[PDB]
Amino acid sequence: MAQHSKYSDAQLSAIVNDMIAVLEKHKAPVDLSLIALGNMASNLLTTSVPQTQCEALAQAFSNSLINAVKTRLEHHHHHH
Amino acid sequence: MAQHSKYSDAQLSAIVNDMIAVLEKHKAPVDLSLIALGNMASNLLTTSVPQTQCEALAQAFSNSLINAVKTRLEHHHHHH
């Protein structure tokens, strides 16, 4: 019943799969789901983040996603 | 108080509420919860909305969240 989450891609995917599948059941038109995300993001960023490192981790999260978007869109590195 | 959803503030709240519920249903730490959210956030922006524009909106929304956290600590106002 204690901490047995060894951080698995299998464990993660199961979580994200449900999150998406559940949202899919209600079937949000993107807009609403982003607002729920916004609500939750604010809630988390004001509760579960280091007080003095809030800006840093918030920038890191964003930055990492921006990079993810970059390599997502740009995936034809060699020979364009 | 302000508006949260222009369509159904009730449906929005229901989505955010059940989102927390489905999270608790799987039992995920703040780490994995953010990892799933990160994959979700990025995947949606890179599918539902214009690629070259969602990147900017991501930054704008992210910076807006930064402003929220910033001005929560900088919640000062002696002048009006």
Long-range contacts of the stretch A65-68 (C-beta < 8 A, 24+): A65/B38, A65/B41, A65/B42, A65/B58, A66/B55, A66/B58, A66/B59, A68/B42
Task: From residue A31, give the alpha-carbon distance in Å to each of A26, B21, B41.
Answer: 13, 21, 12
Closest approach of chain B CAs to the CA of A67, in angstroms? 10
Neighbours of B49 (CB within 10 A): 14
Of B5, B20, B32, the CB nearest to A15: B32
Residue A65: its chain B contacts at CB < 8 A? 38, 41-42, 58
Please state how this structure was obtained: NMR
B4, amino acid identity? H
Q: What is the DSSP letter of B48?
A: T
- What angle (nearest 5°) sits at the alpha carbon of residue A54, between those of residues A53 and A55? 95
The class that CATH gives domain B1-80 is mainly alpha
